[PDB]
């Protein structure tokens, strides 16, 4: 950063790493017929077949117009019943499907009812202070008002993510690390920012320029990507 550029010298980035979102997979499936009897109460689940038996019992009792009007009234109100519950079941499914997918980070700044918070004292909080996007400076105003979701540690945000609806907000490299090592926690969305990380040298280091040339050779030859595999995928 330019304050760190003025402070100390900097070679070309050894990695350009952003910040990204982390939340756990909720991991839901849909269980059988038990999830298929859902709009109606078990009383009516008895009442349906206890009404359905009666038509057959009076048709067998007749063996001892008639059937015309009877059968017309039965079909006539069977249609009413199935129209009511196909309306209720289709509108049940459609009010189900309209909720998803409102998980936006633009949707975070408006309200307090989702947790989403930085690793406090990281560069994440620095970036939220430095944020000039209205949504993320409103999230910054959210975090300033009351912390609500602010964690300080990596494991603290992991445990807040496992114990709440907590978007853990931290650097993308530690999220890659953890999601290689923990499949429940996953990176939600993509990067929040793209910013470069450099090697600190004294102010007035020609060592830094050698280090710059060596970084050019290294990332030309991808020797660091071996190190990327061995430290991020383990």
């Amino acid at each position: 950063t330019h304050v760190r550029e003025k402070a100390i010298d900097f070679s070309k980035p050894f990695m350009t790493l952003g910040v990204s979102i982390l939340y756990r997979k909720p991991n839901g499936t849909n269980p059988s017929v038990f999830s298929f009897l859902n709009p109606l109460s078990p009383d009516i689940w008895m009442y349906v077949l206890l009404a359905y038996l009666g038509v057959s019992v009076v048709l067998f009792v007749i063996a001892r117009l008639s059937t015309r009007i009877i059968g017309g009234i039965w079909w006539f109100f069977t249609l009413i019943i199935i129209s009511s519950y196909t309306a209720n079941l289709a509108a049940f499914l459609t009010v189900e499907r309209m909720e998803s997918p409102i998980d936006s980070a633009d949707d975070l700044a408006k309200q307090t009812k989702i947790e989403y918070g930085a690793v406090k004292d990281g560069a994440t909080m620095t970036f939220f202070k430095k944020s000039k996007i209205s949504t993320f400076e409103k999230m910054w105003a959210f975090m300033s008002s009351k912390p609500s979701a602010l964690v300080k540690n990596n494991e603290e945000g992991i445990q807040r993510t496992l114990t709440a609806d907590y978007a853990l907000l931290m650097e993308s490299t530690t999220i890659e690390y953890i999601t290689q090592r923990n499949c429940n926690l996953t990176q939600i969305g993509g990067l929040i920012d793209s910013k470069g990380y450099g090697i600190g040298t004294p102010m007035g280091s020609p060592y830094r320029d050698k280090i710059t040339i060596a970084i050019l050779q290294l990332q030309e030859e991808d020797k660091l990507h071996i190190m990327k595999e061995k430290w991020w995928r383990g």
Partner: peptide, 22 residues
């Protein structure tokens, strides 16, 4: 229920009896 009068209507329809003996 909401549909409760309709559930009464469904089973009301069975005792509707017309001539058969003659």
């Amino acid at each position: 229920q909401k549909i409760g009068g309709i559930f009464i209507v469904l089973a009301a329809g069975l005792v509707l009896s017309v001539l058969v003996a003659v």
